[PDB]
Amino acid sequence: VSPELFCEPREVRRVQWPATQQGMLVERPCPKGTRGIASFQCLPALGLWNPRGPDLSNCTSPWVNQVAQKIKSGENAANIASELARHTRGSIYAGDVSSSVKLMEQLLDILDAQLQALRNKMHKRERTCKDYIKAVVETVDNLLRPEALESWKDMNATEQVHTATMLLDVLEEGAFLLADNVREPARFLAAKQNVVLEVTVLSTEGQVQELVFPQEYASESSIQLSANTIKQNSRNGVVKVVFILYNNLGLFLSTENATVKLAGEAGTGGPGGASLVVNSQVIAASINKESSRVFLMDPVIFTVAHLEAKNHFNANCSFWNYSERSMLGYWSTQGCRLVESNKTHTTCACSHL
Amino acid sequence: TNFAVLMAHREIYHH
Ligand SMILES: *[C@@H]1O[C@H](CO)[C@@H](O[C@@H]2O[C@H](CO)[C@@H](O)[C@H](O)[C@H]2NC(C)=O)[C@H](O)[C@H]1NC(C)=O
Ligand SMILES: *[C@@H]1O[C@H](CO)[C@@H](O)[C@H](O)[C@H]1NC(C)=O
Ligand SMILES: *[C@@H]1O[C@H](CO)[C@@H](O)[C@H](O)[C@H]1NC(C)=O
Ligand SMILES: *[C@@H]1O[C@H](CO)[C@@H](O)[C@H](O)[C@H]1NC(C)=O
Ligand SMILES: *[C@@H]1O[C@H](CO)[C@@H](O)[C@H](O)[C@H]1NC(C)=O
Numbered sequence: 001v002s003p004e005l006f007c008e009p010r011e012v013r014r015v016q017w018p019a020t021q022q023g024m025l026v027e028r029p030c031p032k033g034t035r036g037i038a039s040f041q042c043l044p045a046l047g048l049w050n051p052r053g054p055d056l057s058n059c060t061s062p063w064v065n066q067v068a069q070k071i072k073s074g075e076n077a078a079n080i081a082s083e084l085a086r087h088t089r090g091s092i093y094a095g096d097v098s099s100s101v102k103l104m105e106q107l108l109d110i111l112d113a114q115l116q117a118l119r120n121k122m123h124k125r126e127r128t129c130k131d132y133i134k135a136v137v138e139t140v141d142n143l144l145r146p147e148a149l150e151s152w153k154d155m156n157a158t159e160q161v162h163t164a165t166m167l168l169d170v171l172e173e174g175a176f177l178l179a180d181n182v183r184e185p186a187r188f189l190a191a192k193q194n195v196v197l198e199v200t201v202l203s204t205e206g207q208v209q210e211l212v213f214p215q216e217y218a219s220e221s222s223i224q225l226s227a228n229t230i231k232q233n234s235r236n237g238v239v240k241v242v243f244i245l246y247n248n249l250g251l252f253l254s255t256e257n258a259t260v261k262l263a264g265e266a267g268t269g270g271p272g273g274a275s276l277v278v279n280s281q282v283i284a285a286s287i288n289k290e291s292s293r294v295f296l297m298d299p300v301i302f303t304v305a306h307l308e309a310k311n312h313f314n315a316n317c318s319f320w321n322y323s324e325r326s327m328l329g330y331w332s333t334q335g336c337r338l339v340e341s342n343k344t345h346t347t348c349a350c351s352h353l
Numbered sequence: 354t355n356f357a358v359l360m361a362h363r364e365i366y367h368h
């Protein structure tokens with residue numbers, strides 16, 4: 001009878017894991033300082049531990065429940081969001097990352113409720129929205145700082161995608177809530193180390209100028225909408241536009257099933273390495289409403305610096321196509337076209353939002 | 354809508 005393979009007992013992520021049969025998933029308590037259940041997959045056939053490490057996505061710090069309790073006691077959403085921003089400044093575990101994003105979603109719904117109750121009210125609504133937005137922009141900045149990225153990697157691939165997608169979704173939704181509570185003309189720009197957000201509400205009457213984002217920022221990415229596009233999308237004489245860019249988020253938006261077109265062989269830079277990667281920041285433009293899927297006669301144009309030029313090729317202009325229901329997605333090239341590309345930069349034109 | 358540029362890692366090296 002040929003041998004069975006087993007993983008060795010190992011301490012990984014400060015959890016002691018038992019000797020385990022190949023193929024088995026094992027559960028153990030989350031590490032000291034957190035609550036929840038951790039798991040670790042012993043790979044089938046190999047009898048080696050999953051090289052990505054244990055799944056700590058269920059492991060949370062005490063502050064997560066504290067914030068959840070503030071929500072129950074009916075505290076103001078903007079104020080709670082501010083506490084969340086503070087908590088994410090420090091050490092955070094994988095479970096804290098996804099909980100933070102879920103908490104921002106919950107807070108957005110609470111905020112929207114408070115806003116409908118104020119349907120001096122107008123300036124109050126605006127102040128409250130801006131307070132919320134500043135808090136979530138800070139929270140996102142905290143979650144994407146380089147020292148927080150290892151915590152994201154303590155979630156499995158699917159949880160990383162789900163969390164990143166929820167993050168993209170909640171920030172955009174929050175931005176459009178702000179757009180509903182400012183008076184034209186308005187421009188609100190918030191620039192941080194790992195995220196920049198702009199909300200602008202403009203009249204389409206008379207002279208309209210193209211929009212270029214960001215401003216006040218030495219950017220690795222920029223995006224623009226033509227004056228005609230703005231005119232063509234007028235609603236009651238106004239347009240509401242949301243722009244966002246993110247640093248490091250692309251790490252988590254998996255290229256599995258990406259619909260890219262390769263003109264050559266894709267390899268890797270190491271054993272078990274990736275052959276297709278997001279090689280730019282993620283940069284977003286939306287008009288009037290989230291997920292409009294509107295066709296643009298004048299395409300949106302964006303230019304990005306490559307994160308690493310060396311040993312990469314075959315730039316493909318893409319957008320994140322995701323389901324609001326499942327919060328999962330994939331990169332699609334549909335309706336996007338490469339305008340120019342060299343070793344260090346690519347310019348793209350996409351015919352839709 | 355959220356946009357980015359994907360790239361492949363090289364496989365083949367000559368000369
Ligand atoms: C994805 O990459 C492929 C391969 O580079 C691109 O196809 C090339 O595009 C250039 C410029 O339009 C053409 O001159 C070549 O003839 C194409 N090569 C091949 C083999 O098709 C494609 O444009 C990229 N797609 C996107 C959306 O960026
Ligand atoms: C951890 O698991 C418990 C039990 O399923 C669940 O109630 C809790 O929400 C989980 N925590 C996180 C952060 O997913
Ligand atoms: C990813 O993590 C979640 C949470 O632990 C788990 O429910 C799910 O089954 C995992 N998926 C995979 C593909 O391992
Ligand atoms: C990618 O495509 C295959 C084939 O349809 C599918 O089985 C798999 O679940 C997809 N991967 C993801 C991340 O959904
Ligand atoms: C690569 O493209 C960028 C972006 O348009 C351009 O500014 C730069 O000059 C190019 N790099 C070269 C040709 O040295």
